[PDB]
């Protein structure tokens, strides 16, 4: 029961969805991990006297 | 298109009726989940006040 | 038949996704919930 037989039945078309999902997930994970590391290892503000 | 009811025969094909049923069920489930999520969010922190 | 089922499904899905993203961003930027570090 599909309206996209060319996307949901073909092996090539069926791999589009998974590839896109994994790419989006990996991009988000990369950004999150980098900024978490930066904000966790960076020093505290340089206070005044 | 013999699975379609008499009223909606001029509008729906046999293959789209099942997908329409799936979409309706998904919409109802999403509505239930959204209702529970909104109730939990209000129970945590009211946004109107 | 005026509207293909495929067109209706695609339009509704895209509108729902865009609205969900917009609502999430607007609720984050308001600074009234204290979620994700205040």
């Amino acid at each position: 029961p599909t309206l996209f037989p060319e996307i949901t039945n073909t092996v090539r078309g069926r791999f589009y969805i998974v590839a896109g999902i994994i790419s989006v997930v990996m991009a988000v994970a990369s950004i999150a991990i980098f900024w978490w590391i930066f904000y966790t290892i960076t020093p505290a503000p340089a206070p005044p006297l | 298109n013999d699975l379609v009811p008499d009223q909606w025969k001029p509008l729906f094909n046999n293959a789209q009726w099942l997908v329409h049923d799936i979409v309706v069920k998904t919409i109802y489930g999403g509505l239930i989940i959204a209702v529970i999520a909104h109730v939990l969010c209000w129970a945590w922190t009211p946004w109107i006040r | 038949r005026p509207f293909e089922f495929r067109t209706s499904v695609v339009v509704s899905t895209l509108l729902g996704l865009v609205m969900a993203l917009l609502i999430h961003f607007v609720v984050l930027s308001s600074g009234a919930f204290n979620w994700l570090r205040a």
Binding site: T8, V18, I21 | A37, L40, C41, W44 | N34, W35
Partner: peptide, 26 residues
């Protein structure tokens, strides 16, 4: 309740995507 709500939403997202992906790819 910041972590708990995030965990709940992420779990819902993962379970829903698993269900829909299983429906599509079968």
């Amino acid at each position: 309740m910041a972590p708990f709500l995030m965990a709940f939403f992420t779990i819902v997202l993962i379970v829903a995507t698993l269900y829909f992906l299983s429906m599509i790819m079968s």
